Amino acid sequence: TVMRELYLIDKNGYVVAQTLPLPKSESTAKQALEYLVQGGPVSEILPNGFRAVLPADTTVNVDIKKDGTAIADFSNEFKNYKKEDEQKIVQSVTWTLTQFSSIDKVKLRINGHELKEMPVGGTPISDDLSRKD
Ligand code: NA
Ligand code: NA
Ligand code: NA
Ligand code: NA
Ligand code: NA
Ligand code: NA
Ligand code: NA
Ligand code: NA
Ligand code: NA
Ligand code: NA
Ligand code: NA
């Protein structure tokens, strides 16, 4: 296994970094996002009191560009979150991706559509989400 940060939601509802041991992978950014999905492989290794963040059955493609941007393009299930978790989800995805050496910012898509706003509640989002946010 390899130590990775997963930005999970704790017993008090906060998005908090947790270090988990993930199997070795040739697509580590995608893998880390797969370990944020409710009901996915993180389920067996969640630390006490923590939960996963992305809706069940969400899948994703991560395309890492030469400028440091990771384009994370989610399946339609990604729309199935609770409104009030909208910004926590953006933060979790952003912080989880930007741990990697080749990613310093994030752009979100759903079903290959570019996102100006998150779908459930309309939170505006830029194409250069980063830890500065
Ligand atoms: Na905590
Ligand atoms: Na809270
Ligand atoms: Na890994
Ligand atoms: Na592997
Ligand atoms: Na693996
Ligand atoms: Na990789
Ligand atoms: Na907790
Ligand atoms: Na779910
Ligand atoms: Na890069
Ligand atoms: Na509401
Ligand atoms: Na980085």
Distance CA 52, CA 33 (A): 10
**CA 61 – ligand 3 centroid, Å:** 16
**CA 24 – ligand 4 centroid, Å:** 5
**CA 58 – ligand 1 centroid, Å:** 24
How far from 11 is each of 4, 46, 51, CA to CA, in Å? 20, 12, 8
Distance CA 59, CA 49 (A): 24
| Ligand nearest the Cα atom of residue 82 | 10
Which residues make Cβ contacts (< 8 Å) with residue 41, sequence separation at least 6?
A: 34, 35
How far from 124 is each of 61, 86, 90, 98, 101, CA to CA, in Å? 22, 10, 10, 20, 27
Which helix H or strand E contains 32, and what residues bound it? helix 28-34
**CA 128 – ligand 5 centroid, Å:** 28
Can you say whether the dihedral through the CA atoms of 133, 126, 105, 10 is positive or negative? positive
Joined together, the tokens standing for residue 13 give: 């509802």
Q: Which residues pair with 62 in a beta bridge?
A: 72
> Which experimental approach was used here?
X-ray
Q: Which resolution, in Å, applies to this structure?
A: 1.0
* 126: helix, strand or coil: coil
**CA 81 – ligand 5 centroid, Å:** 26
**CA 33 – ligand 4 centroid, Å:** 15
